[PDB]
Amino acid sequence: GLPILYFSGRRERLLLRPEVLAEIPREAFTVEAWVKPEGGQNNPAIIAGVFDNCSHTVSDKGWALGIRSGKDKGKRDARFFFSLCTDRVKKATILISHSRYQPGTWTHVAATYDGRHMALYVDGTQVASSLDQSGPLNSPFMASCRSLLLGGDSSEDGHYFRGHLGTLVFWSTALPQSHFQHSSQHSSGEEEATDLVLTASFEPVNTEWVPFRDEKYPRLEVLQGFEPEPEILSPLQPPLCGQTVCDNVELISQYNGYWPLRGEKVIRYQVVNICDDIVSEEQIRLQHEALNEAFSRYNISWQLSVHQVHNSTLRHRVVLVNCEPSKIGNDHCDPECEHPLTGTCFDPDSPKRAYMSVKELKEALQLNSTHFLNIYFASSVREDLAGAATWPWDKDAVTHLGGIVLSPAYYGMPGHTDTMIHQVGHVLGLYHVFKGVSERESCNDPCKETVPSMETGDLCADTAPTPKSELCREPEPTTRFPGAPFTNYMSYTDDNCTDNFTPNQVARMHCYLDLVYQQWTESRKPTPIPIPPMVIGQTNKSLTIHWLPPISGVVYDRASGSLCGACTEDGTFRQYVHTASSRRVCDSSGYWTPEEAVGPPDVDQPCEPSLQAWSPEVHLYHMNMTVPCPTEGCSLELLFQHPVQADTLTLWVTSFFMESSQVLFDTEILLENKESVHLGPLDTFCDIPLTIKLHVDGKVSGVKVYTFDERIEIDAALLTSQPHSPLCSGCRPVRYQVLRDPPFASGLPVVVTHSHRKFTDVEVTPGQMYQYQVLAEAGGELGEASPPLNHIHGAPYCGDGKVSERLGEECDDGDLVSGDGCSKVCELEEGFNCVGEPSLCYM
Ligand SMILES: *[C@@H]1O[C@H](CO)[C@@H](O[C@@H]2O[C@H](CO)[C@@H](O)[C@H](O)[C@H]2NC(C)=O)[C@H](O)[C@H]1NC(C)=O
Ligand SMILES: *[C@@H]1O[C@H](CO)[C@@H](O)[C@H](O)[C@H]1NC(C)=O
Ligand SMILES: [Ca+2]
Ligand SMILES: [Ca+2]
Ligand SMILES: [Zn+2]
C-alpha cells in the first residue's frame, strides 16, 4: 500500500523536522509529486513549498508548487503552477501549465531548477519552462531560515491544498526531462544516490513531519492493493458545437461506415389515448402506419402501445405546452398562455380548474418512460407550434418528464402524419436542417454551416445549409443555398414533399438509440463498442489491444427495474440528485426551481448565467425588490434517492458573483438516522465541478449547501458510493469476447472477463494481418461486434514510442492520451515540439 496525505483545507499544514533533513537544496533542486487535486481549490493553492522561516511577514521568497488561477479570470481556468522567487529577482516568476487540471486524476507534477533553466512538467510532459530566475536561491548564511511545507503556504492567508498527495521526492539537481516519463523506472540509481535529498514516506507522519502552527495532521490514507493504471485513452469528448459522444467526428464516422452499427432496431413508444370514454383509434392506427413506413427503410420499426387514461378530470382540462398555471399575472403578454381559458374556473390554485400544463400532466401520469417513448397530446394555443420533443442530452430523456407532445388535430389525420416524424427525429438527436443559418446567434457562431460539415449546423454533412423556409424549392439568396434539403423530414416544409432522412441523420438516429434509448428497443443485446480496439503495446510474440466500453456506458447486465445502469465496473454507485428544496420563497414561475438542480448537469455553457440551474435570487419581474439572502443564508437541500456510504460528492456550481471565497458559506452533509456534518466554507470555480471526499461514519442521503451569494447556481450534484456497494451486489458485470481474423485456438472467441479493457494475444506471428473485433456480451445475449482493427504484427502504430514518417506520426509520445504534448493521433499540438524517439513534448 502507498500512504497518502489527504489535505481537506481544514487547517492541515505540515513542516519538515530539522533533524530529518540536514540542509535544503539552495542552488539546484527537483521536486516531484503525485498530486490528486479536487475541484474548487483556493486560487493560489500550494501542494508543497520551501518558504522563509525567520521572516514573519509575507514570504513569497523561495518556491511554491501547486495550483494557480489567472488573475484576469479568477473564478475559472485553474492550472498547475510553480512560482520561484530568488533573492535576486524582485518579482516571483511563475510557470503556469497549459491545461486546467483534471480533478480526481492522479497527476505527476514535477518542477526542476538548476541555475537558470526552471521547468515545470505535468505527467512527464514539460508544460512550461523559463530562464527568468538565475543564481542560487539564497545565501547559505540564512539557509537555516528556509523550511519545507506540504499542502500550505507560509502566509497567514492559508493557501490550503484540497486533495491527495501520494508521494514527494526531492533532488538537489534538475533531473533530465526523460526521468519524469520514467519516474517509476529510475528506481534509486546509484549515480544519483547522493542527489536524492528527500523521499517522503507519509506512513508515519509524526516521525518525519510536524504540524505547522497547531494545525491538525492531514488525513492519512492507505491504498488497499495496487490501484488501476491511469487510463491510456482520453474520453471522446463532444465537439464544440456538439452535445454528446455521438456528436464526435470519430464515432459518427464509425457509425456512418460500419453498417452493423446501424442494425435493425425496434423502438417502443406509448400513446396516451385522448377520447371520450379527440384522438380516436383511427388516428392512432394511421399515425403508427405512417411512422413505420417513414422509419422502416432505416432499419427502425416501431411497436404500438396505447395507454388509455380513464381520468375524466384530466380528460376535460385543456393541456397547454409551456403554459404553467403560475405564469398568469406577470405584467407581460405570454404567447403560450393566450388561451380563452387562461384570460369557467380560471383560478390556478383550484383543484377543478379547466386548464393545465403539459408538465403537470406528465407529473400526474408518471408513465413508464424507462422502456417506452411516451406520446402526449397537448393542444397548444399557437397554430404553427404543432408540438415538442425532448432532446437525448436533456436530463429527462428517459424519465417520466420525457417524450413527445403532439396536437391531437395533427396526429394521424391524413396530410399531417409527418409532424410526428419530425418530432421523433428531434427525439433521436436530430437538429433542424436550417441549424447554423437560421438558428444561429451571431456571425461568429462556430456552428454556422457555410459548407457541408460534421461539426457545424445540424452536425450532418449530407444536409446542405438552408434558411428556415416553408417553400418546397431552393430558397432565394438572403450567401447562396444550392441543393437545399427541403425534402428532409427535419425541415419546416409541408408534409407533401418532406420524405427522407439522409444517411448521416440515420447514423445519428442509431447512435442516439444505442447511447441513451437502449431500453426502449426490444433487443436484450448490449449496445455496440463505439470505436475499434487499438494496439497499445507490441512485442515479437504478443500484442495488447485496448477497447472502449459499450457506447451506452452500461457495464452490467441491464435488467429492467434494476440499478445496474448506474453501477461502475468495480461496484461503485453514481447517482444524481433525486429531490430538491429551498427555504427561500419558492418562485412559482417555474424558472430556477429546485428541480433545475436535479438529474444530470444541464448547463451547456458552464460559469455563465443560465436557466437550467437552481438559483435563489433571480426574480424577473421584481427589479426594485432585490431580495437578498437571509441571515441563515440561502440553502439548497439536495436529496439522493438511495442512501450509500458515500465515496465522493460533486457540486456543479456553474455560476456565482461574490468575489469572496465564501460563495459556499457551508456544505452540510446529511446522513441517515444520524446528525449532519458541516464541512465549513469551501472554494469553488465556476467552470469546474467542486468535489469533496466524504469522510463520514454513516450513510449519506443528502447535502444541504448554504450560500451567502445571491446569484450562485447549482446546476446539478452527484454522489459516488463506496466501491463494491451492495446496491450492485446482485448485478452481473459485462464480459467481453474477442475475435481475430484467423480463428483462435479451437476457433472460439477469447473471453476477457476483466474490467480494465485490455487483452493480450500470444498466438500472433510477426508479419501477419489480424482483424480484432470485440463484443460486450452480457447474460448470454451476445452483443454486436465492434468495427474491425486491422493490424500487421510488427508494423508501427501510434503510441509505440517510435516516430514514423511512413504513417504520418509526429510526436509518438508512447501513450494514446491527448493533451500530453501530442494528440492520440500522434500529431503535434499547438506550441509543442516533441523531439526524440520517446517523444518529449515541450512549450
Ligand atoms: C440497415 O440494416 C441492414 C441489415 O438488415 C443493412 O444491410 C447491409 O447493407 C450493407 C451496405 O450498407 C451491405 O454491404 C450488406 O451486405 C447488407 N446486409 C444485409 C444482411 O442486408 C443496411 O446497410 C442498413 N442500412 C441502414 C441505412 O441502416
Ligand atoms: C418499464 O417497463 C418494463 C417492461 O415490463 C418494466 O419491467 C419496468 O418495471 C417498467 N418501469 C418501471 C419503472 O417499473
Ligand atoms: Ca440542471
Ligand atoms: Ca508509431
Ligand atoms: Zn422541430
Residue numbers in the entry: 25 to 301, 307 to 372, 421 to 555, 562 to 926
Show the paper's wording.
Pregnancy-Associated Plasma Protein A isoforms, PAPP-A and PAPP-A2, are metalloproteases that cleave insulin-like growth factor binding proteins (IGFBPs) to modulate insulin-like growth factor signaling. Both PAPP-A2 and PAPP-A contain an N-terminal Laminin-G (LG) domain and a catalytic metalloprotease (MP) domain that itself contains two Lin12-Notch repeats (LNR1 and LNR2). PAPP-A specifically cleaves IGFBP2, IGFBP4, and IGFBP-5, and its cleavage of IGFBP2 and IGFBP4 is IGF-dependent, while PAPP-A2 cleaves IGFBP3 and IGFBP5 in an IGF independent manner.
Here, we present the single-particle cryo-EM structure of the monomeric, N-terminal LG, MP, and the M1 domains (with the exception of LNR1/2) of human PAPP-A2 to 3.13 Å resolution. However, no IGFBP5 density was observed in the structure, suggesting substrate dissociation during the preparation process, and thus we treated the structure as apo PAPP-A2. The structure was reconstructed to 3.13 Å resolution, which allowed us to build a model corresponding to residues 25-926, except for residues 373 – 420 in the LNR1 and LNR2 regions that featured ambiguous map density. No density was present for the M2 domain, CCP1-5 domains, or the LNR3 domain, suggesting that these regions are flexible. PAPP-A2 is a monomer by cryo-EM reconstruction. The active sites of PAPP-A and PAPP-A2 overlay with an RMSD of 0.35 Å. PAPP-A2 features a characteristic metzincin HEXXHXXGXXH motif21 where zinc is coordinated by H499, H503, and H509, and the catalytic E500 (mutated to Q in our structure) is 3.2 Å away from the histidine cluster (with map density shown in Supplementary Fig. 2h). The observed PAPP-A2 domains align with the N-terminal domains of one monomer of the PAPP-ABP5 structure with a root mean squared deviation (RMSD) score of 2.0 Å.
